């Protein structure tokens, strides 16, 4: 946010240089702590409008463009099995915790469930997160394997 000093004795007129001929300046709201140091007392605030250009915004996109030779690169086919086995074991444990959760939920009152899973692993969002993450990783692995097996040959 830019600033520019108040004039001087225009406070005698009390008309700090601000003619509200448009709403475009009044939309911005002065900060709280900024007024503590004095905002409308010594330097009327200004507006800030970053103006872009088609060339610049087109091509700053390149910061999130991966290398072309990385999409078809399958990673080592041992980690993709250890990860699956670990995810399956975690799924088994989380399902057991889900069973005990459902068992315990029968005799709990809402004033506790509103704060029950604050400090302990909620064994439902973990299950959904593990399922979604492993399914996404697995689908990507399948598609990469098949695509390279067909196109590369």
């Amino acid at each position: 946010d830019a600033f520019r000093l108040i004039d001087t004795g225009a406070l005698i007129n009390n008309l700090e240089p601000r003619q509200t001929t448009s709403n475009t300046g009044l939309l911005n709201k002065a900060n709280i702590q900024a007024l503590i140091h004095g905002l409308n007392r010594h330097y009327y605030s200004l507006n800030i409008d970053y103006h872009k250009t088609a060339k610049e915004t087109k091509m700053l996109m390149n910061l999130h463009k991966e290398q072309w030779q990385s999409g078809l690169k399958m990673y080592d086919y041992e980690e993709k099995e250890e990860s699956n086995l670990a995810a399956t074991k975690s799924m088994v444990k989380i399902a057991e915790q889900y069973s005990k959760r459902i068992e315990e939920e029968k005799e709990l009152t809402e004033e506790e469930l509103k704060t029950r899973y604050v400090g302990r692993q909620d064994p439902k969002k973990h299950l959904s997160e593990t399922a979604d993450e492993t399914l996404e990783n697995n689908i990507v692995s399948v598609l990469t394997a098949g695509v390279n097996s067909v196109a590369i040959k």
Partner: protein, 54 residues
């Protein structure tokens, strides 16, 4: 062989003692089966919870 010390198979052809590497029994399927059992139990508990809805 019956005690599974070496995973060979004895034969009565002429006195041969074929020796085979240990089997694999991949852990993924065992984990999947325990998961399936746990999800079965979860299904029964969830339907029991749905009795109040009915």
């Amino acid at each position: 062989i019956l005690d599974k010390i070496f995973y060979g198979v004895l034969d009565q052809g002429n006195g041969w003692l074929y020796v085979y590497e240990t089997p694999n029994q991949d852990a993924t399927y065992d984990s999947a089966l325990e998961l399936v059992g746990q999800l079965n139990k979860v299904v029964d508990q969830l339907f029991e919870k749905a009795s109040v809805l009915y």
